[PDB]
Amino acid sequence: SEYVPPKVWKWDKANGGAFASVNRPVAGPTSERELPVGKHPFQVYSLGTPNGQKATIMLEELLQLGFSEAEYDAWLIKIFEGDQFTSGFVDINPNSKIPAMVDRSGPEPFRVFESGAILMHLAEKFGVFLPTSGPARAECLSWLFWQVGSAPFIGGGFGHFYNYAPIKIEYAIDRYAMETKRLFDVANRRLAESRYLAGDEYTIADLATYTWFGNIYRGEAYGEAATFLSMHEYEHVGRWVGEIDARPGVLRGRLVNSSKGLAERHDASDFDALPPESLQAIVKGF
Amino acid sequence: YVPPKVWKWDKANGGAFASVNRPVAGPTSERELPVGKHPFQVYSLGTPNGQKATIMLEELLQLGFSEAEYDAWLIKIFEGDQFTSGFVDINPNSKIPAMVDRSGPEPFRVFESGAILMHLAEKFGVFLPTSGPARAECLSWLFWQVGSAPFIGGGFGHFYNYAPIKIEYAIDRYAMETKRLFDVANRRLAESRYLAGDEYTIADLATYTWFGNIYRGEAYGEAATFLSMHEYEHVGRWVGEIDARPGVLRGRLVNSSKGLAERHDASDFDALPPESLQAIVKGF
Ligand SMILES: N[C@@H](CCC(=O)N[C@@H](CSSC[C@H](NC(=O)CC[C@H](N)C(=O)O)C(=O)NCC(=O)O)C(=O)NCC(=O)O)C(=O)O
Ligand SMILES: N[C@@H](CCC(=O)N[C@@H](CSSC[C@H](NC(=O)CC[C@H](N)C(=O)O)C(=O)NCC(=O)O)C(=O)NCC(=O)O)C(=O)O
């Protein structure tokens, strides 16, 4: 018979599949441990998921343009193991999610958390990948906030119910597969008539959406999702993914804090530990 | 059940929203948007997300910024108004709120509540530090709100209040996450008056519309009891402080069944009984 929710919700059962070892109804630190700090002006604490890739790609894009103040240390945070709940991590992101960073480029350090805030902070600092004024700024912000507000349906809904939940729940898989397809259709309809999401040039709105959409579209995210969701239908998404795939900052940034690349980045020469081909073409994750 | 190799749109989904939710985007009717006299044209509904936009504009009017005068036209989301050609042209995602900035020589769209908040805060130089570390703190909390409300509304609200069958695993997932998010805010507000510092900013406004509506018992049936809202005393303090702001008291009523269907001039509020603008009862 049908489940009847209690009057008062209680945390009486594991939830999250593999993530049941970390998912809780309360926030805060579970151990006292300071974060490591390197020599570079930006300190990033992350994992090479689509959200971590936004941050490390952005920094590599800035280095591609010659901005030495974008040099960074990218320290590995293993989210299945609860590294996001150390006191040091909670102090830089009260929400205990990656990516989070400390801007140590000025006289006093300060935290920046949330991938969208990291992208906007870096774009504003260096004056690139985000129009500084005018209608084009509003268009870019609209698409960036769209990405941030919609990825929860893609990863927290579809990815979870399709690939991590311990039981396959038809209503939930249908809900979030449908919504993920709708979001791809929004992008596809836009990219039919515009080279990039917020205009004719690559911006942070593209980078933010690309990490998620490219990983799903090319077949590397959530099991058989690309077949399940009929990714072939989104040919304009495919074109735009292909354009962005070719950018050197994307090729480098995708490899940071990645099981297919570097565990950590502490200097530009660190990439010489990888096969050189990894810097020249997309490497799909496991 | 066993998912098929290829997902097909062959079953209803969405419960109360089953008549509007689709796997495809784009318009379902040809209709132009109405346009009024004021510099900002808002197309919205007084849900927590619409309230962000109309409260922000009312906050700006409280500060005397006449360029924040606005027309707020009603978009009925259960009726598919978000899929007219005119609405899709200002928000390709077909969600409220969306806006047209007609304050300058050429009009342009702004869509997403967070982008609307940032656009207005940057235009008028208020509710968002213009530079310095405090700007980064504000942006962090604003993006946090935008990235987490989907779990509260699209997860918890959906499965607890709108889905046709109660699904234990899904209710647990999103009840747990909603409580975690309230706990993040509660732990912050234990040590800070507002989320991003000592002053009210757009990060507070964005979070407040959602958190206050739930905390006070107004959203999602018995959710406030279900989620033990009493546990979050610092959230309660902050809700009560923001509840008292004159711009909140006005803006929360715009495009609302319990207030004004539409707003086309400041005097529109005079048509309501004066009690409508009076102190919000606590539960904060
Ligand atoms: N808005 C934030 C989001 C940052 C974020 O979610 N970071 C996580 C790693 S990215 S992998 C995709 C992620 N899935 C999970 O986090 C799984 C654990 C989660 N608790 C769950 O049960 O689903 C996802 O779906 N993100 C949605 C989104 O990006 O909007 C992370 O650090 N998780 C740690 C955790 O404890 O949850 C931003 O943009 O920065
Ligand atoms: N990131 C956007 C979100 C704007 C938005 O979602 N606007 C909707 C009205 S606000 S009511 C809360 C909303 N719930 C729904 O939209 C219900 C319908 C939906 N299709 C569903 O099945 O759940 C919600 O949970 N929002 C989550 C969030 O704020 O992140 C809206 O216009 N819905 C119309 C539609 O067709 O979906 C922003 O901040 O602006």
Author numbering:
A (entry chain A): 8 to 293
B (entry chain B): 10 to 293
What does the paper say about this structure?
Toward this end, we tested sphingomonads for the ability to break the β-aryl ether bond commonly found in lignin and identified and characterized a Nu-class glutathione S-transferase from N. aromaticivorans that acts as a glutathione lyase in the process (NaGSTNu). Here, we find that Nu-class GSTs from N. aromaticivorans (NaGSTNu) and Sphingobium sp. SYK-6 (SYK6GSTNu) can react with both β(R)- and β(S)-GS-HPV in vitro and that NaGSTNu is the sole enzyme required for these reactions in N. aromaticivorans. NaGSTNu is a homodimer; each subunit contains a characteristic N-terminal GST1 (thioredoxin-like) domain (Val39–Gly129),3 a C-terminal GST2 domain (Ser135–Leu257), and N-terminal (Met1–Pro38) and C-terminal (Val258–Phe288) extensions not present in most other characterized classes of GSTs. In addition, this is the first demonstration of a Nu-class GST having a defined physiological role as a glutathione lyase in an organism.
The structures align with each other with an r.m.s. distance of 0.108 Å over 7381 atoms. In NaGSTNu, seven residues make close contacts with GSH1 (Thr51, Asn53, Gln86, Lys99, Ile100, Glu116, and Ser117), and three residues make close contacts with GSH2 (Asn25, Asn53, and Arg177 from the opposite chain in the dimer). In NaGSTNu, a short channel connects the active site to the solvent. The C-terminal Phe288 resides near the active-site channel in one subunit (NaGSTNu closed) and ∼18 Å away from the channel entrance in the other (NaGSTNu open), resulting in a difference between the monomers in the opening to the active-site pocket. The closed NaGSTNu configuration is stabilized by hydrogen bonds between Lys286 and both Lys262 and Arg220. The open configuration lacks these interactions, and its Arg220 side chain has two rotamer positions. For both GS-HPV stereoisomers, there are predicted hydrogen bonds between the γ-hydroxyl and the hydroxyl of Tyr224 and between the HPV phenolic group and the carboxyl group of the C-terminal Phe288.
